[PDB]
Amino acid sequence: PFPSCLSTVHFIIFVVVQTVLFIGYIMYRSQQEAAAKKFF
Amino acid sequence: PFPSCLSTVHFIIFVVVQTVLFIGYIMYRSQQEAAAKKFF
Fold it and tell me: Is the Cα torsion angle B17, B19, B23, B25 positive or negative in sign?
């Protein structure tokens, strides 16, 4: 039985998911730093 | 038919695409922060 060598399709999905989850994390962190600076 | 393994060229291109878009995006974020700090 074929060993689970990585496919192209699953690789593209996980890179986009890693990019989208980190960009949304950047926007969510940028919104916290903007909101924290507004109170000072 | 062979399972579509992620080629070396296929992996490198998606690394560069993810990195250069990363180079663009974070630099685009700091210039907004620099422009926002210039108006306050």
Answer: positive
